[PDB]
Structure formats: C-alpha cells, structure tokens
C-alpha cells in the first residue's frame, strides 16, 4: 500500500521549477536591499529549501546583517522598516505587511509574474538558518521521510514545522528506527558554535513506507503523552519539561489521531 503515498508526495512536493523561481525572486529582493545593507546576506530558510515544502509554500527569508545577536524587540523592527521604506518604491513589490511578533516579520507579496509566491522576511534571526541546515540533512537521510511528511501535512489540513518535528521524532523513537539523532551523531557538523557562513552545505554524511504512516497515527493516538512526555530533537529521547524543543533556539487532537488510525 506504500505506493500511493509516494504518489501524493511526488504530486504535491516542490518542483525544481518553482525553486528556481524562488531563488530568482530572492535575488530580485537582494538587488533592492543591497543599497541599504551592502554587506548583508539574504538566506533562504524553511520549507522552500529544507526539502519539505509544497509548491504553495511561502518562501521564508533571513537577512543576516551582524555577527552579534540582533534584538528582536526594537532593532529588528527598525531594520525591517528600513527595507519596507525601500520596497515601497519597487514595481515588482505589490504590497507589504509588518508583523509585530516575538520575531518581527516583513510579509511581502509580488507583482506580475510572481503573484503566487509570498515572502516572509525576518531580521538576523539566524537560528532559522541552523534549523533548516539540520532539517535538510534529516530529509536526505532516508528516502521515506519527505514522502511521509507530505501526507502527514495535508491530512492535518483535510503547524507544518511542528508536524515535521513530530514525524522526525517518530522516526527516531517509535517501532522502527529510520533516523538517528543527527546532532549527537555528527556533533562537529551541526554544532551551535559554527558560524553560519561556514556551515557544511556540500559534503555528504559518513556512516517500509506503508507501515510507517499507520504506525505514526498509532504513536500519537494512544502511545504518546502530553504532560509527562515532550518532544526533543537535540537529544533523541522522549523527555519532559504538544510540547516540542527545537534543534536550536486537547483531547480532541487525540480522538482525531485515534479514528484516523482505523484505516
């Protein structure tokens, strides 16, 4: 029964066409931002590059400006307002929204041939870099992860970043052990101490699908607890403080996982 899952996956996953367009668009953003922050770097982060995205996926961007840590309370908002002050006059930009949040976001929508791509831009929030660096290796460790993720996400529809961490966790901890603890296994590569400019995005790493899905729906319907258990990716185990600690920094949702298992 594995086969049809891979079908839905290969049907809805991000195409290489779309990703080229996103990279083009990002280069257009950078051309406009460069007079403002000449030495800055504009990273792609999230779904669009970590290997878990749809074609409908937002492109999340991260403007890196300093080696130091950028305060997200006041400085981030001023930085983002300096970009909006410029993108105001670029024809290819259609509209902008400033989102006050714990991590301020410039949300941007585009004109003419780029109407389907929305950008979410944060200022210098580099943990987003690390999280996508790591998760891009988790998606490439085994061929089954990305297709599993695909069906798990659209099942929720018919948060994405947490659906993924729940999927990665189950492939670390459940019945069959598909994925290791990458942060523990290669501690040099995914260290918190590596400058984001010298992250290994090049070298490979040194050393079925039908039952993984229904096992997932088993692991979270009647096998996982919520106030004695939490999810940790940094350490493989199930630990206790849906609670999830990121790699870097309510009975209705049990009955929902329960009946979806009777299939």
């Amino acid at each position: 029964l594995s086969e049809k899952i891979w079908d839905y996956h290969n049907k809805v996953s991000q195409t290489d066409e779309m990703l080229q367009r996103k990279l083009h668009l990002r280069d257009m953003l950078y051309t406009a931002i460069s007079p403002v922050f000449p030495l800055s770097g504009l990273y792609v982060v999230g779904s669009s590059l970590n290997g878990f995205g749809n074609n409908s996926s937002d492109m999340d961007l991260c403007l890196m400006i300093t080696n130091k840590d950028l305060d997200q309370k006041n400085d981030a908002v001023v930085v983002l307002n300096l970009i909006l002050s410029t993108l105001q006059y670029e024809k290819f930009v259609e509209s902008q929204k400033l989102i006050l949040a714990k991590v301020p976001i410039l949300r941007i929508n585009f004109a003419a041939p780029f109407d389907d791509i929305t950008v979410a831009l944060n200022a210098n929030n580099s943990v987003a870099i690390r999280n996508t660096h790591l998760l891009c290796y988790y998606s490439s460790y085994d061929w089954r992860v990305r297709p599993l993720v695909s069906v798990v996400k659209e099942w929720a529809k018919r948060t994405s970043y947490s659906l993924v961490l729940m999927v990665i966790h189950f492939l670390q901890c459940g019945p069959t052990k598909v994925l290791p603890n990458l942060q523990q296994s290669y501690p040099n590569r995914f260290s918190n101490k590596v400058d984001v400019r010298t992250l290994n995005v090049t070298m490979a790493l040194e050393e079925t699908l039908g039952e993984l899905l229904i096992g997932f729906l088993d692991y979270y319907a009647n096998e996982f607890n919520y106030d004695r258990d939490a999810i940790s990716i940094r350490q493989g185990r199930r630990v206790e403080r849906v609670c999830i600690e990121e790699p870097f920094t309510f009975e209705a949702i049990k009955k929902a996982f329960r009946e979806a298992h009777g299939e």
Binding site: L23, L42, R146, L199
Partner: peptide, 25 residues
Amino acid sequence: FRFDDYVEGAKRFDNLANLIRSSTP
C-alpha cells in the same frame, strides 16, 4: 554599528537544494 559580510555566505547556502535531489528517489 558593526555590519558583517554575509554576501558569499547567503549564496553558498542555496546548494542544500542539491543535497535533497541527490537523495530523492
């Protein structure tokens, strides 16, 4: 205010896109 150079950094980060295609199927 000390700005730092992430220009080359940001562009080299793109090639994680290869890493996944080299994995799938």
